Amino acid sequence: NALVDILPPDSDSSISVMGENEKPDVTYADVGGLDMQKQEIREAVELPLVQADLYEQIGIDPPRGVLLYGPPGTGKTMLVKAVANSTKAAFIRVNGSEFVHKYLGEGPRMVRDVFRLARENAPSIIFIDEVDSIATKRFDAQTGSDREVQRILIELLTQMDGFDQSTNVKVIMATNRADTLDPALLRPGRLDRKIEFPSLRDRRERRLIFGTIASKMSLAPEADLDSLIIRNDSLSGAVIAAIMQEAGLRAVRKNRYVILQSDLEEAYATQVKTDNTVDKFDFYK
Amino acid sequence: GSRRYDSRTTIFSPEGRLYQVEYALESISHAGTAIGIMASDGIVLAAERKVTSTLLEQDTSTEKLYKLNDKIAVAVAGLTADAEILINTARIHAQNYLKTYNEDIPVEILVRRLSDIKQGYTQHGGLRPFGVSFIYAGYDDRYGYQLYTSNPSGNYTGWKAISVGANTSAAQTLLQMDYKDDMKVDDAIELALKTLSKTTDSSALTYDRLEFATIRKGANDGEVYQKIFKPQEIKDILVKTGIT
Amino acid sequence: GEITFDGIGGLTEQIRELREVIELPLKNPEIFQRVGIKPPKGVLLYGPPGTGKTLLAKAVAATIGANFIFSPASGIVDKYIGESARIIREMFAYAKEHEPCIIFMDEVDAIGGRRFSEGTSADREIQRTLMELLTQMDGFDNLGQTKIIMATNRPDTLDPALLRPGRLDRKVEIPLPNEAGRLEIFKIHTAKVKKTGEFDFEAAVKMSDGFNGADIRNCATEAGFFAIRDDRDHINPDDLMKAVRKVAEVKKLEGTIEYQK
């Protein structure tokens, strides 16, 4: 019952995901379309850790945390993962679900562990995937279990402000909706870089995506590569992917591994529903 | 259907203070600031517009300072739609009294009747009450300049300075330190524009977000002259005072 | 218990669509790799009550012989928080050993819905579970030889997130059986019952037109009971006919019949 040897602080890590933090893919569609946003994330996140030297000479403080918000199906949690994986700086990947607890004071003790754990093993990358759930519009205590959600939340704010001017990139967090967040508390200076993800896209932005698709299996010579490009007019990557998935399924039946240009045409055409014009036009038109 | 459901605004409140009237003061303070400064020789009246949109032709459209007649001008803060009805009602009332008696209506009489209409709405009108405060800058020979303001309550109170709209306290506090009883109209022009800029979050309150009017007896041969100042005239006096 | 693959039959095509998604990439991941696409995954089932959606979820499972996890998600919510986070996480991981495995998420609506999250902490939990379920499907690692079928049935709690383009090859709507989709169902049903040979089924279907599957089963249960009260080892063709008159009226009067995006 005596101290015979010591452990790293690194030993006995906080409750954390069974599989890899590390991303097994490097092929990346993260490159091919939203490429402009992929560079931006690199700028805030890759550029200080890799080149410390640059920063020291100008004299700046290490760039501030990064909030990622946009509509979901823009691959937010995947564009940043890719970078962590290939930079090969330490990556701690946690969820609000890890933190959540049924007990009394059990959430916060994990939270203190994350911040310190990052400092120990610096340069270090903190990404909390679920943060939406944790943030509330208004605080409550109507049941006893609301108060627990509230404990995690406050303990997180205090330390987040205090993580400023570490070497370690500040907490990167992702949110599908930001009406859950309160704007005064969570705010620039913690989080001066706030990335908007578009969804209007461009003729060139879409083109990048089609190239990644096309490499996988040579498009039939029934009609040109350039056909796919014309039919999309503003749609985002997420839909592009649903299109290409159906198309090659039907391709397998015919016994050709080439996806026909007809198939993509039919798959594109469909998915038109999304509350028609009848309902609207009887009292909004 | 209609029996079951209720949206009675004509309950006698248990606090002595009708709840609907409470919320209409909140709504007033969202709308821009209007300032009445009463001097011995006039009323200097000035109100900032609350729009700031660039496509919107603010220049042309006066939306707060409306000339009722020669001696009486009103500044509006509150709901602009509700306000329009009371402008026509206030215009016709001064004309009818002028016709009957051949004297411009004393200020007191006009303000009282309009306040009593607001009152009426919650007395037994069934109506939601108009959520507007008006500063009635008025003159009559007997009583000199007279300055009164109205409340959504249907209560008026006289003053030597008043503020409505936003920054009621910020404006009121400056005027108390800087305005003295004896400052003339001339001073009050310089005073008004500068305090407004200092309350508002704008770096310089532009001439195009301003409306300015004066009612003065220092218009020769014992006469009363009003002039709603045009946006470019506001600009020259804006440059003098160094706001721009 | 197993559901005979002859047994299900009533909307052919509709059934063929579930096998393309599931059956094909389990037996051959090779084909999907040769093409290069991400193999087909995610199935969204919606339809009325009684339509045979559980019968269908079961049917695919028996056919392949792939291990089966039948979980209502009314059985994963609990009074204290974060129990739910554990329940799905263990179950997804459990299925991986038992590959091929299909996790039947019955009444996904339960843990569905948007907004909420301001009442009891149980409302915040609902959303939490939905969010983590998505992250496991895609955004963490990809779906292997374990596939997930989502069934829903209440339109009130719906999510644009589970409807969104991405995972899903097929967004499957399961409507009222066909004119002879109902016949096919009728046929199975008259085989089992003892009869003196009854060929009144053509008429019986004219009345019992636009019937959901549940009512095809019900007309045979009510009439056969009438045969047994009448002291017979035979459902007479008279008895089968009488039954469809009675059910037809009370069917349409009380129809719940829900449809979902």
Binding site: L54, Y55, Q57, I58, G59, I60, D61, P63, R64, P183, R187, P188, G189, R190, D192, K194 | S203 | -
Partner: protein
């Protein structure tokens, strides 16, 4: 919130425009000097509501200069820095 029970209550005002200038000054010294003194130009443009807003300008100004590898902090750098920051604040607070 009984009075004299918490015996002192302190409010910190939202910063003055002069108050802002003092914060802006000291962090610029840590970076490199603003050429053609455009420390005033920022303060004349907007008053922050917090010292975080001030910090945000600094970091950004030093960021355009970093890319270039020209230590100078030019008027061009400041002007970008401010507008970029100014947009962001408006899109949260609308």
């Amino acid at each position: 919130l009984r009075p004299g029970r918490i015996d002192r209550k302190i409010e910190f005002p939202p910063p003055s425009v002069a108050a802002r200038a003092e914060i802006l000054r000291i962090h610029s010294r840590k970076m490199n000097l603003t050429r053609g003194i455009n420390l005033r130009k920022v303060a004349e443009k907007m008053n922050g509501c917090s010292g975080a807003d001030v910090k945000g300008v600094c970091t950004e100004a030093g960021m355009y200069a970093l890319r270039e590898r020209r230590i100078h902090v030019t008027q061009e750098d400041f002007e970008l820095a401010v507008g970029k920051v100014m947009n962001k604040n408006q899109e949260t607070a609308i």
